[PDB]
Amino acid sequence: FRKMAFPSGKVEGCMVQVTCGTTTLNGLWLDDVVYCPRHVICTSEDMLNPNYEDLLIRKSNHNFLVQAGNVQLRVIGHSMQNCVLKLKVDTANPKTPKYKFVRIQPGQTFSVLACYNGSPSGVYQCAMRPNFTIKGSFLNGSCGSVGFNIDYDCVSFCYMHHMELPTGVHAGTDLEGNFYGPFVDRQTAQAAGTDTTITVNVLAWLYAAVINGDRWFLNRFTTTLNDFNLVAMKYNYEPLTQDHVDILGPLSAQTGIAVLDMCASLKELLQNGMNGRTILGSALLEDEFTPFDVVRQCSGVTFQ
Amino acid sequence: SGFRKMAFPSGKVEGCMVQVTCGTTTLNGLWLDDVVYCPRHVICTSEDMLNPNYEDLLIRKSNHNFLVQAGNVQLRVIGHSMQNCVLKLKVDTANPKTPKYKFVRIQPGQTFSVLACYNGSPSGVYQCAMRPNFTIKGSFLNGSCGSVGFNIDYDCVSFCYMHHMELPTGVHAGTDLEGNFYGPFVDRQTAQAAGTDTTITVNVLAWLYAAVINGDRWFLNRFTTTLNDFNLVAMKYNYEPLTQDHVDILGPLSAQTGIAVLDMCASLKELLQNGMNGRTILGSALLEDEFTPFDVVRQCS
Ligand SMILES: *C(=O)[C@H](C[C@@H]1CCNC1=O)NC(=O)[C@H](CCCC)NC(=O)/C=C/c1ccccc1
Ligand SMILES: *C(=O)[C@H](C[C@@H]1CCNC1=O)NC(=O)[C@H](CCCC)NC(=O)/C=C/c1ccccc1
Numbered sequence: 001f002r003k004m005a006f007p008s009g010k011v012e013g014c015m016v017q018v019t020c021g022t023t024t025l026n027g028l029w030l031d032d033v034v035y036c037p038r039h040v041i042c043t044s045e046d047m048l049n050p051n052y053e054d055l056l057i058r059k060s061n062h063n064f065l066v067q068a069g070n071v072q073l074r075v076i077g078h079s080m081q082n083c084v085l086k087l088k089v090d091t092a093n094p095k096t097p098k099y100k101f102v103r104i105q106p107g108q109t110f111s112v113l114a115c116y117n118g119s120p121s122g123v124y125q126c127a128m129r130p131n132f133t134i135k136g137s138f139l140n141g142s143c144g145s146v147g148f149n150i151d152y153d154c155v156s157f158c159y160m161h162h163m164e165l166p167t168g169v170h171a172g173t174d175l176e177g178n179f180y181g182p183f184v185d186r187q188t189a190q191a192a193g194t195d196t197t198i199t200v201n202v203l204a205w206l207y208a209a210v211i212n213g214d215r216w217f218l219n220r221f222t223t224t225l226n227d228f229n230l231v232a233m234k235y236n237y238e239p240l241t242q243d244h245v246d247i248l249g250p251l252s253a254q255t256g257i258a259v260l261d262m263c264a265s266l267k268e269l270l271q272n273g274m275n276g277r278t279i280l281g282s283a284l285l286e287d288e289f290t291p292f293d294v295v296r297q298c299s300g301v302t303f304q
Numbered sequence: 305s306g307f308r309k310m311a312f313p314s315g316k317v318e319g320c321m322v323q324v325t326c327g328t329t330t331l332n333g334l335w336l337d338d339v340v341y342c343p344r345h346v347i348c349t350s351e352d353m354l355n356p357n358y359e360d361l362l363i364r365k366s367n368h369n370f371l372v373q374a375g376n377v378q379l380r381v382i383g384h385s386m387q388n389c390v391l392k393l394k395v396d397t398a399n400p401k402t403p404k405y406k407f408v409r410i411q412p413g414q415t416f417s418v419l420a421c422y423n424g425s426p427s428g429v430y431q432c433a434m435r436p437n438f439t440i441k442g443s444f445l446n447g448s449c450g451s452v453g454f455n456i457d458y459d460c461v462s463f464c465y466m467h468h469m470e471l472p473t474g475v476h477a478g479t480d481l482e483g484n485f486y487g488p489f490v491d492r493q494t495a496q497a498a499g500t501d502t503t504i505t506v507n508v509l510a511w512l513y514a515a516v517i518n519g520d521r522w523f524l525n526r527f528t529t530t531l532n533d534f535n536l537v538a539m540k541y542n543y544e545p546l547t548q549d550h551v552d553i554l555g556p557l558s559a560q561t562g563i564a565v566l567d568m569c570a571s572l573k574e575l576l577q578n579g580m581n582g583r584t585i586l587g588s589a590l591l592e593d594e595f596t597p598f599d600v601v602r603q604c605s
Contacts, residue, residue, distance in 0.1 A: 002443040004428035007419060009315025113313065120313035122603070123429060137306035137603055168305055168518065283589055300445035304422035 001208050001280070001289065001297050005111040006150040008123045013095030016073065017118030018087065018144065019065040026115040026144030027066065027087070028160070028175070030096050034066050034073070034087040035175060036144045037162050038080055039185045047187035056080055067118060082177030083185050084160065098154045101175035106130040106238070107198040109290050110147040110158050114138060127201070127288035128159075130238050131193040132181025133169040136161070146175070165192055197287050199237045200244035203262055204291040207251035209279045211298065216277060218257065221264035228263040235270045247291045254298075307514050307586050309594070310603055311417035312456040314429040319401030322379070323424030324393065324450065325371040332421040332450030333372065333393065334466070334481075337402050340372055340379070340393040341481060342450045343468050344386055345491045353493035362386055373424060374399075388483025389491050390466065403461045407481035410464040412436045413504040413544070415596050416453040418465070423447060433507070433594040434465075435475070436544055437499040438487025441594075442467070442476040452481075471496055504593040505543045506550040509568050510600045511592045513557035515585045517604045523585060524563070527570040534569040541576045553597045560605070 018027040018036045021043065027036035041059055042050050059078070064087055066073040077088030104110065106128050114122045114137065126134045126147060138145070138161060147159030162185050163171040169192060171183040183190050209215065229239035245259050252259045274283055296303050324333040324342045327349060333342035345353065347361045347369075365384070370393055372379040383394030410416065412434050420428045420443065432440045432453060444451065444467055453465030468491050469477040475498065477489040489496055512523065535545045546569065554565045575591065586592070 002430060003309070004420070004430045004443065005311060007315075007318050007426040007429055008313045009318040009426070012313050012315040114310070120315075122310040123313055124308040124310045126308075135306065135308075137308040137310060139305070139605075164305065170306070284584075297443070297445075300422050300447040303420075303427050303445055304425050304447070 001212075001294060003125045003289065004297075005123045005125045006148065008111065008113045008120065010095075010097040010150065010155050011113045011146065011148055012120045014093060014097070015113070015115050015118050015120055017065075017067040018085075019067070020059070020063060024117055025141060026118055028144070028146055028157070029066075029068065029073070029089070029093045030099060032089055032092045034075075034089055035160070036085050036087070037160065037173075037185065038083050038085045038177070039143070039162070040085065049186055052080060056085075069118070080177075083162065083173050083179060084175065084177030100154060100156045102156045102158050103174045103176075103178070104128055104158045105243075106132065107201055107244075107290065108158075109288060109293060110149050112136060112147045112159070112161075113145060114142055115145045116141045125288075126159075127198065127290075128180065129169070129192075130196045130198060132179075132183075133165060133171055133192045133195075134159070136170040138164065138170055163190070165190055167192060196236050196238045197285070199232055199240055199266075199287075200248065201287045201290055202237070202285050203248055203259075203266060204251060204294045205286045205289055206262055206266060206279070207248070207255055207257070207291070208289070208294040210255045210257060211251075211294070212280065214280055217265050217269055217279065218261075219265050219268050221268065222258070222261050223264040223267060225260065225263070228260070228267060231267055231270070237270070250295055251291055254295075305518060305604070307518050307603065309431045310599075311429045311431045312454065314417065314419045314426065316401075316403040316456065316459075316461050317419045317452065317454055318426045320399060320403070321419070321421045321424055321426055323373040325373070326365070326369055330423060331447060332424055334450065334452055334463070335374060335379075335395075335399040335402075336405060338395055338398045340395055341466070342391050342393070343466065343479075343491065344389050344391045344483070345449070345468065346391065350493075355492060358386065358389075358491075362391075375424075386483075389468065389479050389485060390481065390483035404459055405461045405463060408462045408464050409480040409482070409484070410434050412438065413507060413596070414464075415594060415599055416455050416464050418442060418453045418467075419451060420444060420448055421451045431594065431599075432465075433504065433596075434486060435501050436504065437501045438485075438489075439471065439475040439477055439498045439501070440465070440486075444470060444476055453478075469496070471498060473497070500542075503541075503543045503591070505538055505546045505572075506553065506597065507593040507595055508543070508572060508591050509546075509550075509554060509565070510557060510597040511586070511595045512568055512571060513554070513561055513563070513597075514595065514600045514604060516561045516563060517557075517600075518586065520585065522583065523571050523575055524567075525571055525574055527574065528564070528567050529570045529573060531566065531569070534566070534573060537573050537576060543576075556601055557597060
């Protein structure tokens with residue numbers, strides 16, 4: 001089991017450059033619309049608290065330079081939806097994959113295609129933290145890079161990059177321009193809420209350990225969900241939702257270990273330590289691998 | 305800012321991946337212009353795999369014994385040859401998506417991106433390193449043979465690896481694109497052990513510089529060391545030797561952080577001798593050796 005990105009080719013064919021003034025960032029070209037962060041229309045003397053509505057009144061179609069490589073795509077319409085700008089262009093992208101826009105929950109993972117000037121430079125796997133930040137890797141000019149999942153041949157876009165926070169973590173929106181968490185696209189220092197450990201993913205990691213025959217931590221206890229949730233929060237663990245219980249179903253069926261029995265096993269690991277031992281080679285409990293991520297990597301048949 | 309294990313965008317390689325089938329065996333091939341490259345053991349039955357005479361099995365095959373599929377269309381095989389452990393299938397169609405490319409043989413300690421494929425379908429991408437014992441710590445399942453490793457520079461894809469084998473310890477072995485294995489391994493169905501692995505010293509130091517660039521300095525000290533005395537301790541702890549070339553390649557990271565290379569060596573020596581004492585570096589409880597100096601500069605500058 002390993003942290004793996006989705007192949008990025010379907011997304012690479014969608015990356016473009018958007019320039020307004022001397023500010024260049026990345027945009028996402030799907031059919032005849034280009035999606036990008038709206039702060040591309042900001043000047044260096046106006047980022048502190050931009051009035052985006054009045055800044056955009058000042059802009060016409062001909063103020064936007066959209067480029068696929070060095071090839072210009074003429075902008076024939078523009079609008080703002082929350083914190084994203086939607087630029088209608090004169091050319092439908094022939095590389096447009098089958099796609100959806102989706103808003104992910106904390107704990108869900110996705111691949112990020114980090115881009116600069118519309119040129120992809122790297123791909124890595126991220127998790128949405130419970131405080132709605134991501135521990136990403138972004139340099140200047142990265143805004144507009146997107147995060148995504150791929151299921152069969154459909155790309156589910158879930159993240160567009162906008163901000164770095166003082167602590168070095170990152171914040172952004174879904175593809176309707178709505179920020180994850182309490183952040184705003186302003187040139188200010190914004191504090192992330194206090195983070196927690198992603199319980200459902202820890203449990204997925206324990207199931208993965210069991211699947212591999214590493215199962216010393218399986219105890220003889222069970223628990224109710226409410227009892228577990230109340231203890232978990234005292235160790236800075238997220239509480240479990242009904243949806244979390246249900247996405248652990250397949251792993252519970254595969255191993256024969258009831259979800260609530262594994263919760264009792266995790267509770268013991270929180271109240272005592274690992275003694276000295278490790279799980280899957282590590283002394284730390286991994287929390288950025290989802291139940292889906294574990295199920296996929298069990299065999300070639302499921303991973304394809 | 306930030307630090308992640310980062311792979312190269314895989315789109316240029318995705319357009320080259322195909323499915324090759326011989327009899328009951330299916331794996332992946334690499335389609336460049338009008339040739340498909342794939343592991344030669346695709347021609348083996350489960351009988352053959354135990355002790356294949358590969359020249360033996362191949363002369364008994366004809367072109368129509370090979371079924372090559374690219375996405376949804378069959379490519380017709382019109383020629384076949386063998387170069388070391390790779391098969392070269394000539395097909396009657398050029399791959400329009402052929403990128404600019406080169407075949408390279410990489411050195412131990414260097415990194416590359418792996419595009420893991422199953423039945424010709426790319427399914428994940430991750431970053432690996434060629435270990436000093438010429439294994440790779442991959443994640444490969446059944447059907448993954450013929451997946452390739454690569455680096456990209458501008459628009460040119462440098463293919464350095466094609467996947468063939470898993471060892472009993474769970475690490476992996478494979479060839480360059482000329483079909484020559486990395487390390488002492490062979491394409492037969494036997495349990496094979498590697499030589500004793502060592503830690504890639506120059507990469508650990510690059511990673512420590514990354515940790516400093518990202519604001520973490522707890523492991524630094526005011527000691528220094530000579531290069532030879534550092535190498536004495538490194539060899540004691542199963543680390544590869546650090547050469548003057550390594551010291552030079554660390555130059556840019558040293559200049560960026562203001563920490564002389566031999567001072568960082570002194571930090572690493574202390575970490576080797578004292579342990580990490582339950583602390584973390586870039587979220588890791590272990591010293592990480594699969595980031596090269598170039599990888600760190602690329603991601604942190
Ligand atoms: C977009 O390219 C950029 C991404 C940053 C660059 C460095 N790493 C990243 O992730 N986004 C911004 O720079 C953003 C624009 C603000 C809209 C007008 N500004 C910030 O992210 C600054 C945050 C900050 C942190 C601490 C103190 C002040 C400001
Ligand atoms: C090709 O797809 C496959 C890749 C393996 C499958 C599981 N994970 C991988 O990386 N390659 C083989 O299966 C290879 C075929 C070569 C014989 C012609 N055989 C092995 O890798 C055998 C390993 C082994 C381990 C222990 C004891 C015997 C054999």
